[PDB]
């Protein structure tokens, strides 16, 4: 009674990934130099250290 | 005529130094130079905000 054929199985798995992405930079850089005698205007102290 | 080394000095210069201290700071500076009388006044600021 117990020795009988058995059955079979087909066993499929599915892996499934998806992605997105975006990215957005905006920059701006700038600079003045000017100079009046005696009277100046700049960027920094070493600016108007230079422009002299 | 008393110091030896002469062309100038940038830190001995300046009276109050109190920068702020970051890589995206944004300043202004001026000046008043004379040089006949000898006279030289100069005067940054700077600054920064940022948020995220």
């Given at each position: ?13 599915r892996?499934?990934t ?13 600079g003045v ?7 100046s205007?700049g ?10 | ?17 109190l ?17 006949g009388?000898g ?14």
């Amino acid at each position: 009674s117990l020795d009988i054929p058995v059955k079979q199985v087909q066993i499929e798995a599915r892996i499934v990934t998806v992605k997105e992405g975006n990215l957005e930079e905006l920059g701006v850089r700038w600079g003045v130099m000017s100079t009046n005698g005696s009277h100046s205007v700049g960027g920094s102290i070493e600016s108007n250290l230079w422009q002299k | 005529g008393l110091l030896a080394d002469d062309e100038f000095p940038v830190d001995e210069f300046l009276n109050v130094n109190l920068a702020s201290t970051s890589a995206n700071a944004s300043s202004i500076a001026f000046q008043v130079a004379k040089l006949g009388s000898g006279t030289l006044l100069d005067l940054e600021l700077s600054a920064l905000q940022n948020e995220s």
